[PDB]
Design a protein around this ligand. Structure first.
Ligand SMILES: CC(=O)N[C@H]1[C@H](O[C@H]2[C@H](O)[C@@H](CO)O[C@@H](O[C@H]3[C@H](O)[C@H](O)[C@@H](Oc4ccc5c(C)cc(=O)oc5c4)O[C@@H]3CO)[C@@H]2NC(C)=O)O[C@H](CO)[C@H](O)[C@@H]1O
Ligand SMILES: Nc1ncnc2c1ncn2[C@@H]1O[C@H](COP(=O)(O)OP(=O)(O)O)[C@@H](O)[C@H]1O
Ligand SMILES: [Mg+2]
Ligand SMILES: [Mg+2]
Length: 290
């Protein structure tokens, strides 16, 4: 489609984005398909087409919603969910409906043996490629370097991605996308203290027991925090599929670079993605001659 047109479902042609008037009328609410702190998502109908309708849950988080919509329009690409309509005045927008839900429910989807054949390594590794391909485009976005902040644990990280009906990974929940400027200082992912090993080590309070947490005193980090969580996401996406034991071997060294304690030594998302594509191709040639 042209830049701001869309063709979803059984559409024969692309339509320009729906604006506030047609959304209030032509978009009818059906079934809630997703909750969240920032949003409520309803499966909906617009002109015989199934669609996704995201509303602002609580007025408390109006700013997060509007910027997530601001970034959603800014980063419409092959790596992000397809936008359908925008009406920020009503704090609401419309995107393409993906019936497989989030990639959080991946193993349940591949359990359905209408999707058993796709429970292969070339599908799961492609999803990981799409994941790193998104992160590569994120850190080099037209809106400057951006950081996927809403990713403190593994499951919340997966909840921000969708599974298109052809086993492709798409980003969706872009409410928290700060920009890393080339000036310095960096960014922070929230106004409260983060903990755990799933977040990057620089995302932790570095002062210990004597100094209690304080938002102004947190130094600040960059996009390498996304590199940090790539193996844990990659480990989930491959699961234990036939062949993934060989793939993790090939990716061990690039796994070990993403998990470096010093962030400036971690590989860029384009460095990670290139290894992922080359391993995919190598095992595609290894399978061919058998
Ligand atoms: C309100 C605010 O602080 N927005 C800033 C924003 O913050 C993000 C933050 O970047 C990340 C920290 O990782 O976390 C966001 O909140 C998460 C939270 O981490 C958990 O995953 C989870 O928490 C809840 C809490 C309540 C509910 C409710 C009742 C209902 C429900 O169904 O789910 C939850 C889950 O989910 C939230 C959101 O996904 C935090 N965002 C929010 C809305 O709190 O970061 C940007 C730039 O990064 C600015 O700092 C914002 O000001
Ligand atoms: N287009 C969509 N198609 C199908 N499922 C969706 C779509 N958008 C959201 N979902 C579901 O809504 C959930 C919450 O979406 P999200 O953007 O992350 O809300 P929030 O910002 O409140 O956390 C997703 O994890 C997912 O299950
Ligand atoms: Mg979410
Ligand atoms: Mg959100």
């Amino acid at each position: 489609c042209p830049p701001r047109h869309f063709k979803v479902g059984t559409m024969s042609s692309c339509s320009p984005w729906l604006k506030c008037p047609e959304i209030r009328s032509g978009v009818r609410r059906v079934k809630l398909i997703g909750q969240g702190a920032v949003k409520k998502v309803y499966l909906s109908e617009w002109q015989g087409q199934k669609v996704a309708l995201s509303v602002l849950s609580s007025d408390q988080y109006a700013d997060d919603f509007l910027h997530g919509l601001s970034m959603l329009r800014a980063l419409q690409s092959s790596h992000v969910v397809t936008l359908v309509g925008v009406c920020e005045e009503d704090a609401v927008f419309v995107t393409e409906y993906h019936p497989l839900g989030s990639v959080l429910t991946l193993d349940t989807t591949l359990a359905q043996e209408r999707y058993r054949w796709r429970n292969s390594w070339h599908t799961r590794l492609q999803l990981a490629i799409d994941y790193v391909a998104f992160l590569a485009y994120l850190h080099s976005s037209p809106a400057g370097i951006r950081v996927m902040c809403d990713s403190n644990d593994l499951h919340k990280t997966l909840s921000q991605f969708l599974l298109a009906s052809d086993m492709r990974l798409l980003a969706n929940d872009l409410d928290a996308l700060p920009e890393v400027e080339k000036g310095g200082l960096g960014v922070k992912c929230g106004h409260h203290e983060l903990t755990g090993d799933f977040v990057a080590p620089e995302q932790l309070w570095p002062y210990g027991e004597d100094f209690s947490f304080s938002d102004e005193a947190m130094p600040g980090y960059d996009e390498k925090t996304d590199i940090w969580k790539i193996p844990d996401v990659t480990r989930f996406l491959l699961g234990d599929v036939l062949g993934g034991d060989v793939i993790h071997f090939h990716l061990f060294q690039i796994y070990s670079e993403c998990k470096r304690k010093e962030a400036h030594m971690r590989p860029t998302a384009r460095e990670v993605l290139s290894v992922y594509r080359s391993v995919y191709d190598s095992m595609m040639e290894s399978q061919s001659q058998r």
